[PDB]
Design an enzyme around this catalytic site. Sequence first.
Site, PDB file in Angstrom:
ATOM      1  N   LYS A   1      42.063  38.598  34.486  1.00 19.88           N
ATOM      2  CA  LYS A   1      41.336  38.777  35.576  1.00 19.88           C
ATOM      3  C   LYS A   1      40.135  37.962  35.671  1.00 19.88           C
ATOM      4  O   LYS A   1      39.887  37.543  36.707  1.00 19.88           O
ATOM      5  CB  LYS A   1      40.474  40.225  35.023  1.00 19.88           C
TER       6      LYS A   1
ATOM      7  N   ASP B   1      41.812  44.316  38.863  1.00 23.33           N
ATOM      8  CA  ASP B   1      41.071  45.189  37.631  1.00 23.33           C
ATOM      9  C   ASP B   1      41.402  46.693  38.203  1.00 23.33           C
ATOM     10  O   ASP B   1      42.365  46.903  39.193  1.00 23.33           O
ATOM     11  CB  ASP B   1      39.786  44.566  37.723  1.00 23.33           C
TER      12      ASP B   1
HETATM   13  N1  LIG Z   1      37.916  43.732  42.296  1.00 21.36           N
HETATM   14  C1  LIG Z   1      36.449  43.025  42.105  1.00 21.36           C
HETATM   15  C2  LIG Z   1      36.557  41.916  41.139  1.00 21.36           C
HETATM   16  C3  LIG Z   1      35.102  41.334  41.054  1.00 21.36           C
HETATM   17  C4  LIG Z   1      34.820  40.546  42.002  1.00 21.36           C
HETATM   18  C5  LIG Z   1      35.269  39.959  42.977  1.00 21.36           C
HETATM   19  C6  LIG Z   1      34.481  39.501  44.170  1.00 21.36           C
HETATM   20  C7  LIG Z   1      35.087  38.950  45.103  1.00 21.36           C
HETATM   21  C8  LIG Z   1      36.222  38.504  45.230  1.00 21.36           C
HETATM   22  N2  LIG Z   1      37.043  38.756  43.874  1.00 21.36           N
HETATM   23  C9  LIG Z   1      36.489  39.486  42.967  1.00 21.36           C
HETATM   24  N3  LIG Z   1      33.353  40.276  41.671  1.00 21.36           N
HETATM   25  C10 LIG Z   1      33.055  40.974  40.883  1.00 21.36           C
HETATM   26  C11 LIG Z   1      31.837  41.275  39.857  1.00 21.36           C
HETATM   27  C12 LIG Z   1      31.517  42.140  38.815  1.00 21.36           C
HETATM   28  C13 LIG Z   1      32.671  42.897  38.534  1.00 21.36           C
HETATM   29  O1  LIG Z   1      32.775  43.630  37.324  1.00 21.36           O
HETATM   30  C14 LIG Z   1      33.970  42.709  39.126  1.00 21.36           C
HETATM   31  C15 LIG Z   1      34.059  41.763  40.198  1.00 21.36           C
END
Ligand code: A1ID3
Length: 315
Positions: free
Chosen positions: A239, A258
């Site tokens: 991830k 995730d």
């Molecule tokens: N599926 C969300 C995964 C994720 C992103 C993200 C943002 C933009 C593009 N892809 C992933 N940013 C995060 C910040 C904190 C967190 O716990 C999870 C993420």
Amino acid sequence: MRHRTLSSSPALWASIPCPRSELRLDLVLASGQSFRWKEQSPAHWSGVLADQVWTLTQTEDQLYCTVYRGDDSQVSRPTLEELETLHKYFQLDVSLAQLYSHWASVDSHFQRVAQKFQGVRLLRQDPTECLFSFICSSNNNIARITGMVERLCQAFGPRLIQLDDVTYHGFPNLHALAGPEAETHLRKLGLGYRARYVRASAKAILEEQGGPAWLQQLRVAPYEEAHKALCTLPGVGAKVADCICLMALDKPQAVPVDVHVWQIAHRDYGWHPKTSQAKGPSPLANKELGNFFRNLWGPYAGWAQAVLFSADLRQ
Ligand SMILES: NCCc1c(-c2cccnc2)[nH]c2ccc(O)cc12
Ligand code: NI
């Protein structure tokens, strides 16, 4: 010195032609890509890009920016090279409207979401910053990551400038995070178990991989090689590695899978693992789901899923 507004000091701002459909600052700068931007005044976003501080705001057709250089540099509008840096940061060479229509052509769910949530694009971040940011991301929300990153930068990176009561620091170099007291200090700053991964990954890059040039090489390597290389680092799994691929190593097809992406796939797409047998997440089923999304949306699948993430953060 004070944070600028477009009114305060219009002579210190420059503009980049940029429609609201190509970029919405408010759906991008605090939607969990960079953790270093804050709306210090209404519609005005301040944060650090590469040892300089910027404030950004926009109209319907224009992106306005202003730069603070820190060291008794007589105040002045952004130069051309500084404006190019920003243009490249928002990857504005890429047409988001053409991407939106291409994804929408195969995805009616995306089509409905995209109506309301235009201008969500991917920043192109510094690999070092993005790596340690996402190491901090495990079992964590945006607000908590943001504090950890700010405290990390204040404790270990160079001071740049103060504006109002906010002191801005540069992201630290690896050697600063690799030192013998680094983990201890980082636990004192609230990082928990993640303090160990930060120090260990800094040390690994420096000692096993030959420093941050390695991250630049990953940026030109193929997605699959970059991802696997990142997964050799302490605290970095599939991830986190996909985050870094997408956001800092120019792998637009990387889809970080995730629980949130699982929920979207199941709920909104009706997806269930086919080839795999696990009812729920597993490394194999997570890999399968990322492949599902690339098959659906194409080589910019990571950008598409970003729209859905940003959309979901807004109620
Ligand atoms: N599926 C969300 C995964 C994720 C992103 C993200 C943002 C933009 C593009 N892809 C992933 N940013 C995060 C910040 C904190 C967190 O716990 C999870 C993420
Ligand atoms: Ni079901």
